[PDB]
A = this chain, B = another copy of it.
């Protein structure tokens, strides 16, 4: 028909449905584990690349610090490039300094105790890295060295192996690591999303209501508190030139 009545709710439905279908497709179409993971990870990266403010980059990467320690391979890194160099780039493959990182996520097909623990380990391999911070020159003078921002960590999946999907067994698994490996938020595209409440010191699960869109908004809102990354001391990395 010729009726036209704009709906904001429909936009958020369509945003989520696109993610859910493409993740379902990646799982069903690719019967090779490498291709299936690459396909799914790309769906999440495209969502962040499309919708996050441009102050954020989103890509697969290794993280490195000025002590010469490296993270594991991170499926989805959210990081700064406005104020931060790459440490190494070779064609499309990138290694980013720890000081550039805002958030790190593991992306897999279905939530489980083993996957949650694996994600907790990936996140810990980033949070253990050392980050420098120098006083920051700006138009109004020089700020003190910014105190180190929290790196957000999380888990992104299509499905859940538990029944109910987002129940006590998921909660138990999340409480397995409340320090270096703590997962601040995550999304189960077929069911809902979760986040850690700092005030109550507990995990909250939110069911349905456009899970991928709700996760995206939660990520944007939480990132706002981080402001910009602290200012990197590239000469700390330069000790390794000799």
Write the residues of chain A forming the contact surface with B, with a CB cutoff of 8 angstroms. 2-12, 14-15, 17-18, 21-22, 25-35, 38-39, 42-43, 46, 50-55, 62, 64, 68, 70, 73, 81-93, 95, 134, 136-140, 143, 146, 209-210, 213-214, 216-217, 220-221, 224-228, 230-231, 233-235, 237-238, 240-242
Contacts and interface: CB of A to CB of B under 8 A. Distances in A.
Give the copy number: 6
B234 A93 contact: no
Contacts of A88: 11, 14-15, 29
A137 B217 contact: no
29 contacts: A4-B32, A4-B33, A6-B32, A8-B70, A8-B240, A9-B240, A11-B29, A11-B64, A11-B88, A11-B95, A12-B237, A12-B240, A14-B25, A14-B90, A17-B21, A26-B90, A35-B62, A50-B86, A51-B86, A51-B89, A52-B85, A54-B81, A54-B82, A136-B139, A138-B227, A138-B228, A217-B237, A217-B241, A221-B235
A222 to B, nearest CB: 10
Contacts of A30: 90, 93
Contacts of A5: 31
Contacts of A91: 39, 42-43, 46
A29 B4 contact: no
Contacts of A3: 27-28, 31
Contacts of A54: 81-82
